[PDB]
Amino acid sequence: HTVYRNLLYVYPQRLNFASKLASARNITIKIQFMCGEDPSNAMPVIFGKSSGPEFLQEVYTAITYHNKSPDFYEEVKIKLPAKLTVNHHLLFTFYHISCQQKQGASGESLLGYSWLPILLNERLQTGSYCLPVALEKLPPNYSIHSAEKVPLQNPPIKWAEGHKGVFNIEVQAVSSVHTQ
């Protein structure tokens, strides 16, 4: 069946932590398209791998190329809601393997978060972004701000690498015909 849709395409390109103790292959990233700040606000809008198509609330990825073909790129494809508002945002959750866990464990745990409002300052947020990572948790009302400039919070936000941008993505909206 032939359909026409306006889709958001998100390319998680590079993750560049300064830590010589970790590598990007060991950081997992969860990607969600949110309509609000509550955990229940993940929209079922991400194209899955299956035919159908299936729509997911989240995808997990690791930004590394050592185990990929040279032609590889990660492409997250999102069915935009017909009406996009300031409440819609990409939400990224980072997971890592903490060193020297109890009993020698080697499971993954929450590292932090980043996000990108899709509409900010009356402009669609397409193009290239280098995003910082907020550690531990997100403050209320995070999603109306760019992660690069959040008002002072109480308790205060802590950022990876003193608020340096570490996560490179590209974002574009494309409306086209799909032959589902």
Numbering used by the authors: 557 to 736
Quote the passages of the study that discuss this structure, keeping the authors' original sentences.
DOCK8 is a Cdc42-specific guanine-nucleotide exchange factor that is essential for development and functions of various subsets of leukocytes in innate and acquired immune responses. We show that the DOCK homology region (DHR)-1 domain of DOCK8 binds specifically to phosphatidylinositol 4,5-bisphosphate (PI(4,5)P2) and is required for its recruitment to the plasma membrane. Structural and biochemical analyses reveal that DOCK8 DHR-1 domain consists of a C2 domain-like core with loops creating the upper surface pocket, where three basic residues are located for stereospecific recognition of phosphoinositides. The DOCK family proteins share two evolutionarily conserved domains: DOCK homology region (DHR)-1 and DHR-2.
To understand the structural basis for the specific recognition of PI(4,5)P2 by the DOCK8 DHR-1 domain, we performed X-ray crystallographic analysis, and determined its structure at 1.5-Å resolution. The crystal contained one protein molecule per asymmetric unit. The DOCK8 DHR-1 domain consists of a core structure adopting an anti-parallel β-sandwich with a C2 domain fold composed of a pair of four-stranded β-sheets, having a concave face called “β-groove” among C2 domains. The core is elaborated with two insertions between β2-β3, and β7-β8, and three loops (L1 through L3) that form a positively charged pocket on the upper surface. Notable distinction is found in the conformation of L1 to L3 loops and electrostatic surface potential of the upper surface pocket. In the DOCK8 DHR-1 domain, L1 and L2 loops mainly create the upper surface pocket, whereas all three loops participate in the pocket in the DOCK1 DHR-1 domain. In addition, the electrostatic surface potential of the upper surface pocket is less prominent in the DOCK8 DHR-1 domain.
